[PDB]
Amino acid sequence: DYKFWYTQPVPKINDEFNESVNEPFISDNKVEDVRKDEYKLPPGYSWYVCDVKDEKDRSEIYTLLTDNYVEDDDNIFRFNYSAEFLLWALTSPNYLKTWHIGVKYDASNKLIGFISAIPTDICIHKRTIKMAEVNFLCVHKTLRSKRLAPVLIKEITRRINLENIWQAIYTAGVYLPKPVSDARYYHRSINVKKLIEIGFSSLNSRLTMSRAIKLYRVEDTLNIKNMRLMKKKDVEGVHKLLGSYLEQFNLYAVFTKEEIAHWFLPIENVIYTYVNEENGKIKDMISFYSLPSQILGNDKYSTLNAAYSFYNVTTTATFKQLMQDAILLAKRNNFDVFNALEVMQNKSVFEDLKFGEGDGSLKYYLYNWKCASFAPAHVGIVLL
Ligand SMILES: CCCCCCCCCCCCCC(=O)CSCCNC(=O)CCNC(=O)[C@H](O)C(C)(C)COP(=O)(O)OP(=O)(O)OC[C@H]1O[C@@H](n2cnc3c(N)ncnc32)[C@H](O)[C@@H]1OP(=O)(O)O
Ligand SMILES: NCCCCCCCCCC(=O)N[C@@H](CO)C(=O)N[C@@H](CCCCN)C(=O)NCCC1CCCCC1
Ligand SMILES: [Cl-]
Ligand SMILES: [Mg+2]
């Protein structure tokens, strides 16, 4: 059952809506009526507002997620967002410090839970709505299944509603009421022997080690020869190319110029964006973010270096050629695997480019919004 989720303005498990339905579960909400008081925590635990711009607070969030964040279904790989990744993820334009909420255990003064949101304009089925994007919900492994997570959820909802914002977008690997879409992850091996060693991949009695290395070999030469790291001059051209491209989709972020600068200007070991400029015009782009996983219980390796497909647009090449070059640039940047969801145009190139189907899928959710669900080809946004 979903005893907490049932109490929320989200679809029931059997709710099915027509294409023409595109509206809040609960309208005419009033900032005036929102609770002013912080939700109650169990005895000896306290809210804490985290300053992600302070290196020590940001270290505390980092340590909590390194120890306690999401794993694969077999508990071998744990997401290991870097501290600098977290700074970038949480400091987007017009972010609110008061949306970065920790919970401390009073007796140790240590952070045991966290939840965050950033503001984002989201276009769902051709209506743009101010939303919050919720991410990084984490409770310490030692305090699980004590119903802390609905306290964290209800508290960020209250803070977000104080800002006159009544919809949110979030993603999870767990099934919850009720996905507006569901995208499988696919994986394109780069460092094959490592991936075998750590049990990310496997060999069969058809594939020997040398065969598997040969299969995934790539030519160190770009299809689009001028693709280069994006520069601050490129920001308006990226904004034009990406903004135009994204409008075809059922669900996508509407980016200002300033969000473009934030979300794409490269930061080593965090975000990589490459552009093809022609005539002072940006005609193609490739982006991917770095998200390592800590490898649990492997004597030889501690970390799996992984690049995640972000936003990719081509006007002068094929999309296969574009994504071939995205794999190469990730190889050039020392990544072991290139990961992508079956969103946008991506699935169309998976078989050709030797991506393998994963064992997880990422569900997309909206809070307080009622709409038809859609196939993930129609999803045009990637959350972190
Ligand atoms: C308008 C503004 C709106 C703002 C708010 C919008 C919504 C934002 C929602 C958040 C979006 C975050 C997106 C995001 O960060 C990306 S998805 C990743 C979330 N993080 C992890 O998976 C970290 C590893 N696990 C944990 O820390 C814990 O297991 C957590 C904290 C997840 C659950 O802690 P726990 O100790 O295992 O459980 P209880 O405390 O006993 O709580 C049980 C209740 O929590 C429901 N639950 C479990 N996992 C959930 C999940 N991933 N989303 C939503 N709900 C989730 C569960 O169904 C149950 O409710 P139910 O009885 O109805 O079934
Ligand atoms: N919601 C925001 C973020 C948090 C939610 C994120 C939810 C996802 C959490 C992590 C997760 O399950 N990853 C999956 C996605 O497939 C994953 O890596 N599988 C890998 C490793 C499986 C390890 C064993 N079990 C996987 O299949 N390799 C197969 C690779 C292979 C390459 C060669 C060709 C065939 C397949
Ligand atoms: Cl080259
Ligand atoms: Mg709990």
Numbering used by the authors: 27 to 410
List passages from the publication reporting this PDB structure.
CaNMT shares 44% and 43% sequence identity with P. vivax and L. donovani NMTs (PvNMT, LdNMT) respectively; we reasoned that inhibitors of Plasmodium and Leishmania NMTs might be acquired through a ‘piggy-back’ approach, using CaNMT peptidomimetics as a platform. We therefore chose to employ a similar peptidomimetic scaffold based on the Ser-Lys motif, substituting the first four amino acids with an alkyl chain capped by a group that mimics the N-terminal amine, and the C-terminal leucine with a hydrophobic motif. The N-terminal motif of the peptidomimetic was expected to interact directly with the C-terminal carboxylate leucine of the enzyme, a critical residue for catalytic activity responsible for the activation of the N-terminal amine of the protein/peptide substrate. Using antifungal NMT inhibitors as a platform, we developed inhibitors of Plasmodium and Leishmania NMTs, resulting in the identification of an inhibitor, 10, with sub-micromolar potency against P. vivax and L. donovani NMTs, and the most potent Leishmania donovani NMT inhibitor reported to date.
Reduction of the alkyl chain length from n = 10 to 9 gave compound 10, which is the most potent L. donovani NMT inhibitor reported to date (LdNMT IC50 = 24 nM). It also showed somewhat lower activity against HsNMT1 (IC50 = 60 nM) and PvNMT (680 nM). High-resolution ternary structures of compound 10 were achieved in both PvNMT and LmNMT, with the latter structure revealing the first structural evidence supporting the proposed catalytic cycle of NMT. 10 sits in the peptide-binding pocket, and mimics the key recognition elements involved in binding the parent peptide (GLYASKL). The N-terminal amine electrostatically interacts with the carboxylate of Leu410 whilst the hydroxyl group of the serine hydrogen bonds to the His213 side chain. In addition, there are ionic interactions between the amino group of the lysine and three neighboring aspartic acid residues (Asp98, Asp100, Asp385), all of which are conserved in equivalent residues CaNMT. The aliphatic chain on the N-terminus and the N-terminal amino group of the inhibitor are guided by the peptide binding channel to the C-terminal residue of PvNMT–Leu410. Unusually, the inhibitors in this study showed a higher specificity for P. vivax NMT in comparison to P. falciparum NMT. An alignment of the primary sequences of both enzymes (see ESI†) highlighted four differing residues within 6 Å of the peptide binding pocket: Ile102, Tyr212, Ser228, Tyr334 (PvNMT) and Val102, Phe212, Cys228 and Phe334 (PfNMT). Of these differences, the replacement of Y334 to F334 in PfNMT constitutes a structural change in the peptide pocket that could lead to a loss of potential hydrogen bond interactions within the catalytic site.
